[PDB]
Coordinates of C-alpha atoms in Angstrom, one line a residue:
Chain V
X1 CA 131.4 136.2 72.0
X2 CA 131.2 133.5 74.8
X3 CA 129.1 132.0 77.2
X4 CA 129.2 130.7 80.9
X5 CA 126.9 128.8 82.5
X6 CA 126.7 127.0 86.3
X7 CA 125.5 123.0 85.8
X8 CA 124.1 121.7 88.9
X9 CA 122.8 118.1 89.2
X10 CA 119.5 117.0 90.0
X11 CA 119.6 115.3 92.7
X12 CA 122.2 114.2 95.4
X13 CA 123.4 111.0 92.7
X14 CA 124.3 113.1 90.0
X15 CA 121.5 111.0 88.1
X16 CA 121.6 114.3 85.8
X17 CA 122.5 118.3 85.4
X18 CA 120.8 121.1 84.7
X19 CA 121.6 124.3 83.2
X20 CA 119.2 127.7 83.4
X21 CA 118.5 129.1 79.9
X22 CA 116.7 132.1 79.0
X23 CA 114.2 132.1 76.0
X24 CA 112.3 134.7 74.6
X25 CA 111.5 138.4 75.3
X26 CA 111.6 139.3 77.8
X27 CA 113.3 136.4 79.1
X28 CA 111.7 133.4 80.1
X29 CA 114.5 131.1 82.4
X30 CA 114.0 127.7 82.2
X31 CA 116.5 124.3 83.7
X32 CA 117.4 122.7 80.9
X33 CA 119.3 119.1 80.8
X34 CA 122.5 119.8 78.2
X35 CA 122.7 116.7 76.1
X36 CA 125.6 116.1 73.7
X37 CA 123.8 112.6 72.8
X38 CA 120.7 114.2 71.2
X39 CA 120.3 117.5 69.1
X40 CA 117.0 118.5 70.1
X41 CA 116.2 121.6 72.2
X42 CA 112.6 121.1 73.3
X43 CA 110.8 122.3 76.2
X44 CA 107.5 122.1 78.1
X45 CA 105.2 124.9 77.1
X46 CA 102.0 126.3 77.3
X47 CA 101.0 123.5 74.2
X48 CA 101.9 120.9 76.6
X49 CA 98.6 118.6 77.6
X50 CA 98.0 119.6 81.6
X51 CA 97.6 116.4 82.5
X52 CA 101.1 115.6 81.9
X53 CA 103.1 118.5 83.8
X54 CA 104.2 117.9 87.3
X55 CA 105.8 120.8 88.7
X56 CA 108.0 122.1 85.6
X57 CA 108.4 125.4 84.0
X58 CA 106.8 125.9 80.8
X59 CA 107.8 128.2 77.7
X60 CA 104.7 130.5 76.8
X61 CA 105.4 131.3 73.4
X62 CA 102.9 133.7 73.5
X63 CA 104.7 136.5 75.9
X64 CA 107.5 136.6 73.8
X65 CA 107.7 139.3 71.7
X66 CA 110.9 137.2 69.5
X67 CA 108.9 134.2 68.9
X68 CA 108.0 133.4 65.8
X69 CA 105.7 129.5 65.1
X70 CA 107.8 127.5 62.1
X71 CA 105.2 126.6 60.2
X72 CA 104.5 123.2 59.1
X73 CA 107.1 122.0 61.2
X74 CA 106.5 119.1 63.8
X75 CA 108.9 116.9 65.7
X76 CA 108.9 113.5 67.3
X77 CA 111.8 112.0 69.8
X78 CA 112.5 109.2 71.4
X79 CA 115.5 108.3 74.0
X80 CA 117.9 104.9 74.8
X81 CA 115.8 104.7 78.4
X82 CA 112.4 104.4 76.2
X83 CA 111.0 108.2 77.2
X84 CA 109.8 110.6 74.2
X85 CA 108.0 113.7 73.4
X86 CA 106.8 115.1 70.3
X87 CA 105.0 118.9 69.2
X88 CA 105.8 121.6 67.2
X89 CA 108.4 124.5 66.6
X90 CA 108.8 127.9 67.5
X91 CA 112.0 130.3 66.2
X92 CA 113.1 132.4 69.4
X93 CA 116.2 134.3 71.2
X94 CA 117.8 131.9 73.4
X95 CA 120.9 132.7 75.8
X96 CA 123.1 130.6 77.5
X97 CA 125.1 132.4 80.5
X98 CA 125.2 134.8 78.7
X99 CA 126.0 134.0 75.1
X100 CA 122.4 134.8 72.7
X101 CA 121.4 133.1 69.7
X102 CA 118.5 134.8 68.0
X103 CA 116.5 132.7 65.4
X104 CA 117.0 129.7 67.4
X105 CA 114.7 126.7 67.1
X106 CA 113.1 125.9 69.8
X107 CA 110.9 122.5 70.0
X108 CA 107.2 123.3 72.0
X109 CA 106.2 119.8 73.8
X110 CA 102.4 119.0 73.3
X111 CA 102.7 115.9 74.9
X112 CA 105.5 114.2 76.9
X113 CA 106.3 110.5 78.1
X114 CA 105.7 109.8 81.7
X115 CA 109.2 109.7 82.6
X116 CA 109.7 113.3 81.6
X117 CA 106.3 114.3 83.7
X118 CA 107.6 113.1 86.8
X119 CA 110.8 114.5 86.4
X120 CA 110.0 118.3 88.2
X121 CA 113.5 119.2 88.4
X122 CA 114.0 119.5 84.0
X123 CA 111.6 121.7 82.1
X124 CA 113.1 119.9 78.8
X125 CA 116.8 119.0 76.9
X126 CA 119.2 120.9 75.6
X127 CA 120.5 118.5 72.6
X128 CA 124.5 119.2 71.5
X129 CA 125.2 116.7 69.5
X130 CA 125.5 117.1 65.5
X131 CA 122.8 118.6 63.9
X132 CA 121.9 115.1 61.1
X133 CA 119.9 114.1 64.2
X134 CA 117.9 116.6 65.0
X135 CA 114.1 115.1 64.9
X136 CA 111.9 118.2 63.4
X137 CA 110.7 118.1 59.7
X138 CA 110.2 118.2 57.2
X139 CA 113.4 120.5 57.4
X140 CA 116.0 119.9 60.2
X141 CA 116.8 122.3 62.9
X142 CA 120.8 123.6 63.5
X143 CA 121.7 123.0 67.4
X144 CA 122.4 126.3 69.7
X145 CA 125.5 124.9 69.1
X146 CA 125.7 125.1 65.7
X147 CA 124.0 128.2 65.8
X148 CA 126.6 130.3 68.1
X149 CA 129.7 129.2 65.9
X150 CA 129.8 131.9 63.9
X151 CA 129.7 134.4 66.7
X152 CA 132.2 132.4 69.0
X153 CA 135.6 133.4 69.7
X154 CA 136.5 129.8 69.3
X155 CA 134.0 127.1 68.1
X156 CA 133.9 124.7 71.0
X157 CA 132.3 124.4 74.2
X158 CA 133.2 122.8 77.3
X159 CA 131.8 120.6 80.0
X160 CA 133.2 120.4 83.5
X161 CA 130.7 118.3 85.5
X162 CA 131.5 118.0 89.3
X163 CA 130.9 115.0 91.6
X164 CA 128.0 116.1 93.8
X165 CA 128.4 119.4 93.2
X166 CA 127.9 122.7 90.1
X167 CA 129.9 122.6 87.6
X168 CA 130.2 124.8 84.1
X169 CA 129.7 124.7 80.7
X170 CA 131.7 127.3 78.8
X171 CA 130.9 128.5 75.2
X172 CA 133.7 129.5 72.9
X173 CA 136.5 130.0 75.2
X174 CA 138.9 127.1 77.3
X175 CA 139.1 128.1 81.0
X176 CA 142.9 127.0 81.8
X177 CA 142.6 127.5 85.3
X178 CA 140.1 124.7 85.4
X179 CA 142.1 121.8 84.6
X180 CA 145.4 120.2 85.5
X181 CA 148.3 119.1 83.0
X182 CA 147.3 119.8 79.0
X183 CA 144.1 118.6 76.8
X184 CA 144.5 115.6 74.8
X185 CA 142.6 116.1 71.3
X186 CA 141.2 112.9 70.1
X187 CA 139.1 112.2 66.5
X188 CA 135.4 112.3 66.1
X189 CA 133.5 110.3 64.3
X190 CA 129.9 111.7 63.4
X191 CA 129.3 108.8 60.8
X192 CA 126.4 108.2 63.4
X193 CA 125.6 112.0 64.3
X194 CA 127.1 111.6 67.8
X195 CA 130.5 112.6 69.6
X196 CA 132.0 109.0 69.1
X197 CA 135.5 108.3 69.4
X198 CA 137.7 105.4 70.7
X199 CA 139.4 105.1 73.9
X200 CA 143.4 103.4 73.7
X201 CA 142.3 100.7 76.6
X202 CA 141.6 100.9 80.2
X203 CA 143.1 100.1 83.5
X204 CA 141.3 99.0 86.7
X205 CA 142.9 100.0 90.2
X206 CA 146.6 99.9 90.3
X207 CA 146.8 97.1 87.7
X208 CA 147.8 97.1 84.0
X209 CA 146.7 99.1 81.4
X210 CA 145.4 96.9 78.7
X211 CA 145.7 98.3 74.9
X212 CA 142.3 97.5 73.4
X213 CA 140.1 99.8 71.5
X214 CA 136.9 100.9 73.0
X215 CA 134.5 102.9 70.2
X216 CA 132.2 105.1 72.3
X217 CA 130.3 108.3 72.5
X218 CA 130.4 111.1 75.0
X219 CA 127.2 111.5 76.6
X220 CA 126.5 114.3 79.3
X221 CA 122.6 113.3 78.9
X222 CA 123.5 109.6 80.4
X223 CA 124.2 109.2 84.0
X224 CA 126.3 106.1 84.3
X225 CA 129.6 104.4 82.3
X226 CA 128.4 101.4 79.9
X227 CA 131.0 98.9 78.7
X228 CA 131.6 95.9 76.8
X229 CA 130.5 93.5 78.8
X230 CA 134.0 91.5 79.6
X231 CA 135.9 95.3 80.9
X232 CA 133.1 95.5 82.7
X233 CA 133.5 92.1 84.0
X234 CA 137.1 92.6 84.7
X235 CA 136.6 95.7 86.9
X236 CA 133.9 94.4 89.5
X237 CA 136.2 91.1 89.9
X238 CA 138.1 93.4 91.7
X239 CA 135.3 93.9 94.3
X240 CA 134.6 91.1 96.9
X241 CA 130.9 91.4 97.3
X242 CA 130.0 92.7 93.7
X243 CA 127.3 90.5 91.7
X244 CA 125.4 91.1 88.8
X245 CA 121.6 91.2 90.4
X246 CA 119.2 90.3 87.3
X247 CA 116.0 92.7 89.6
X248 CA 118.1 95.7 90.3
X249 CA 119.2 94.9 86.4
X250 CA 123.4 95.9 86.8
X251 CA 126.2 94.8 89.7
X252 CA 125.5 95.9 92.9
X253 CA 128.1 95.6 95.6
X254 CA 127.9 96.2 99.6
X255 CA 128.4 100.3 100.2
X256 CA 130.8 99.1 102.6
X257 CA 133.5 98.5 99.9
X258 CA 136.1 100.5 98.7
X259 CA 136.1 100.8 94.9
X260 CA 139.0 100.7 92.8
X261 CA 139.7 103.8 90.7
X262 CA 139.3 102.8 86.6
X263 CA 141.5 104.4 84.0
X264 CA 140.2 104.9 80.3
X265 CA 143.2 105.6 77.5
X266 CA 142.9 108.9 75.4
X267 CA 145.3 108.4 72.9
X268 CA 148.6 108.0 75.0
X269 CA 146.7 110.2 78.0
X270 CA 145.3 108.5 81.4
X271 CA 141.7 109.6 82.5
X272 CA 141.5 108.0 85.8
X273 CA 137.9 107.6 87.9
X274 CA 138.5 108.0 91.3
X275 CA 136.7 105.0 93.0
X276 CA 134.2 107.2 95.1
X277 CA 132.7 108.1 91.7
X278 CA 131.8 104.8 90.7
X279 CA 129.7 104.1 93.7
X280 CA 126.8 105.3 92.4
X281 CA 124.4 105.2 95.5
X282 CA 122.4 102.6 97.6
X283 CA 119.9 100.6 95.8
X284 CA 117.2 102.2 98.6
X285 CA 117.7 104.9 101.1
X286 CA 119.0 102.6 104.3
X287 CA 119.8 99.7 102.2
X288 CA 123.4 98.1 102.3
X289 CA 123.6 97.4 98.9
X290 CA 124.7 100.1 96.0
X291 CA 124.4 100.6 92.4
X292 CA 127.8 100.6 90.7
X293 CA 128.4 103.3 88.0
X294 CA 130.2 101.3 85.5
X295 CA 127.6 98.7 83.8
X296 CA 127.6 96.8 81.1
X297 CA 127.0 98.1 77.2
X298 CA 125.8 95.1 75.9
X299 CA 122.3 95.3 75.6
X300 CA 122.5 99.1 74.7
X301 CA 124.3 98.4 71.5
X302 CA 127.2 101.2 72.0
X303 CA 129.5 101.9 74.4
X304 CA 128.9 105.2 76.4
X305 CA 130.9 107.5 78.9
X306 CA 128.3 108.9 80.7
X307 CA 128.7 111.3 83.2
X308 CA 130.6 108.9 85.4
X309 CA 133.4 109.2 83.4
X310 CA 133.4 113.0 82.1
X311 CA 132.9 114.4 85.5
X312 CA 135.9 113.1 86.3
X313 CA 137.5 115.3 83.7
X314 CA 137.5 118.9 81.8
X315 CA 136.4 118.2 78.0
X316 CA 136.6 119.8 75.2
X317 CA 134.2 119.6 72.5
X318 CA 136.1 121.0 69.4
X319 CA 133.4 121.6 66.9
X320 CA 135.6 123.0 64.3
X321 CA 135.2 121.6 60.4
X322 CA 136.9 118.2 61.4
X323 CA 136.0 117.9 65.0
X324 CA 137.7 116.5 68.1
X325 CA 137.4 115.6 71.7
X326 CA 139.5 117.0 74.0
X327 CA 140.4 115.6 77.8
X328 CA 142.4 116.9 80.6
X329 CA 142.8 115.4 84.4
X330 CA 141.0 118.1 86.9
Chain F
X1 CA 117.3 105.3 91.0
X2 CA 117.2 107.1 88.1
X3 CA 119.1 107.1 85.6
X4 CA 119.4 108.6 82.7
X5 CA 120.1 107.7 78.9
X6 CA 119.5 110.4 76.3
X7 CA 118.3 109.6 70.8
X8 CA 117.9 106.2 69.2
X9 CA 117.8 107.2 65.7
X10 CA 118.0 103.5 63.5

């Protein structure tokens, strides 16, 4: 079996995607934000406090025939930007474009942060990454991931984001007609439960590519490209009226500029960022100052592509025994 | 303006 589902983002910065996903029986379609840097799916519901839902769709586990309450089972989360959510756990059909999974668990908010509240645009995540970090207990919960291998015609799924515009995720199949040239297959680490691997080096603009290793995970649940600190560094000297701005907390630079393209290694592959990509929007609406999209890692602890970098290419996330990540230029 | 950054887990 496979799956195929349209990702569009959010807003009109990419800031995030969604996916529709139907749970339950009948069908109940909610926008999901896919998130290969957590392995949680969890939604609002009908358990969810009122007070905190602002325009979202909620899971009523009650009108599906399917469901079926884990019991004993609670979960609690919390996320690198400081938002969480915590509830309890329902087992239920759940299909992506397409693809079902029956028996799948799915995490019923009872409360959620304040960021997720005023977020109308995502009735809850998605997670994809490996299943050691999934939150609920006292027993852990297999990702829809994890869940659809055996039925896949392949184990893998794909993510094509696109720059201010839908995009797909595919389940169990690679679309060749959506990328150019061939996949490069790099390792995975999942010592830490994420897709982490490490990038050959970088290049910024039309200068040299510099052969340094750069361990990082691939995140479609974070917007932006986070660095070590002196890349980082290295690319915005290449723009004449970057800074780093301690309020705004990142470099800005005048939306006026032109922005170099930056390449990141994959093994002996190129990914190159066009420029336009990097300029992540103005700091306001009017203003003459804009957010840049690479930043730097430091204070985060790892170093993340973000959707920055993987919607500038088709990847490949091989989820066989030994797993790899795949990238192709599109 | 906003962005995202999805687990801590240690």
């Amino acid at each position: 079996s496979t799956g195929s589902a349209t990702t569009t983002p959010i807003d009109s910065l990419d800031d995030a995607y969604i996916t529709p996903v139907q749970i339950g029986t009948p069908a109940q379609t909610l926008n999901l934000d896919f998130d290969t840097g957590s392995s949680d799916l969890w939604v609002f519901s009908s358990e969810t406090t009122a007070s905190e839902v602002d325009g979202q769709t909620i899971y009523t586990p009650s009108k599906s025939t399917t469901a079926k309450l884990l019991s004993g089972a609670t979960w609690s989360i919390s996320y690198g930007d400081g938002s969480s959510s915590s509830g309890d756990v329902y087992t239920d059909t759940v299909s992506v474009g397409g693809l079902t999974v029956t028996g799948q668990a799915v995490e019923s908010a009872k409360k959620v942060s304040s960021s997720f509240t005023e977020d109308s645009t995502i009735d809850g995540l998605l997670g994809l990454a490996f299943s050691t970090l999934n939150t609920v207990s006292p027993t852990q919960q297999k990702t829809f991931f994890d869940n659809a291998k055996a039925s896949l015609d392949s184990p893998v799924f794909t993510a094509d984001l696109g720059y201010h515009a839908p995009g797909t995720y595919n389940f169990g199949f690679i679309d060749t007609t959506a990328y150019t040239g061939s996949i490069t297959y790099t390792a995975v680490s999942t010592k830490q439960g994420f897709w982490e691997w490490t990038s050959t080096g970088y290049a910024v603009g039309s200068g040299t590519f510099k052969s340094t290793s750069i361990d990082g995970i691939a995140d479609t649940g974070t917007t932006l490209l986070y660095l070590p600190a002196t890349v980082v560094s290295a690319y915005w000297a290449q723009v004449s009226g970057a800074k780093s701005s301690s309020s705004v907390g990142g470099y800005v630079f005048p939306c006026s500029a032109t922005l170099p393209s930056f390449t990141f290694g994959v093994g002996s592959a190129r990914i190159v960022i066009p420029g336009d990509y990097i300029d992540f929007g103005p700091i306001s609406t009017g203003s003459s100052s804009c957010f840049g999209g690479i930043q730097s890692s430091a204070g985060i602890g790892i170093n993340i592509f973000g959707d920055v970098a993987l919607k500038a290419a088709f990847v490949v996330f091989n989820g066989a025994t030994t797993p790899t990540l795949g990238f192709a230029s599109k | 303006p906003h962005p995202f950054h999805x687990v801590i887990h240690k």
